[PDB]
């Protein structure tokens, strides 16, 4: 669920999630990484976990509508940057 912008999960977040105090979220994340569910690292000095992957699974129609919305945004950004570059460099495009 967390987007790549702020995929820095926190020990307190994982505590408010599946019920465990913050002294074994470390072990839980270790188990996840070892099994291969997720990838990344755990900065326990700052008490947060960096996730750079997730094992994909099967989704719901609403979970795909969310992906559709995210695409809509991405397409809009790409089109805007395309128009900007094309207009700016119009006089040198071959």
């Amino acid at each position: 669920t967390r987007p790549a912008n702020h995929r820095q999960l926190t020990f307190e977040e994982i505590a408010k999630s599946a019920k465990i105090t913050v002294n074994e979220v470390e072990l839980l994340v270790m188990k996840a990484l070892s099994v291969g569910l997720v990838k990344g690292s755990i900065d326990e000095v700052d008490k947060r976990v960096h996730m750079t992957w997730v094992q994909p699974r099967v989704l719901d129609l609403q979970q795909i509508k969310g992906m559709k919305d995210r695409l809509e945004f991405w397409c809009t950004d790409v089109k805007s940057m395309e128009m900007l570059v094309e207009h700016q460099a119009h006089d040198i495009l071959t």
Partner: protein
């Protein structure tokens, strides 16, 4: 945007998905290559409308613009497929959804401070060379 050839291999296997299985095609990676004796003919036929086999700044900028065009077209195709599958016209293809999930996992984070600093450092190096 793409090559004129699409390749398909007929695979019929019990879907680990657990869904009814039907003998259908599966996409195969395709490419265009040429013998040397075909490269000579191709180049001769294209001699009049050929591009330079070197990166001239105008052509490199044009290539970047074409890259943006291709990326936009591919994103539009994916969005249209997502529209159709969401509304219900098409069924949910699990491999498609897996690949899209992996793509969104693979999107970078460009607002990270440690990345912004390195980016400015490299931009300044390139600009001093320029």
């Amino acid at each position: 945007l793409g090559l004129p050839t699409e390749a398909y291999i007929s695979v019929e296997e019990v879907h680990d998905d657990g869904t009814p299985t039907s003998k259908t095609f599966e996409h195969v990676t395709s490419e265009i290559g040429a013998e040397e004796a075909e490269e000579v003919g191709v180049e001769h036929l294209l001699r009049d409308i050929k591009d330079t086999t070197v990166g001239t700044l105008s052509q490199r900028i044009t290539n970047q613009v074409h890259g943006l065009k291709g990326l936009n077209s591919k994103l539009l195709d994916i969005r249209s497929y997502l529209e159709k599958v969401a509304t219900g016209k098409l069924p949910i293809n699990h491999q498609i959804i897996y690949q899209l999930q992996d793509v969104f996992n693979l999107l970078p984070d460009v607002s990270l401070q440690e990345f912004v600093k390195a980016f400015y450092l490299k931009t300044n190096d390139q600009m001093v060379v320029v």
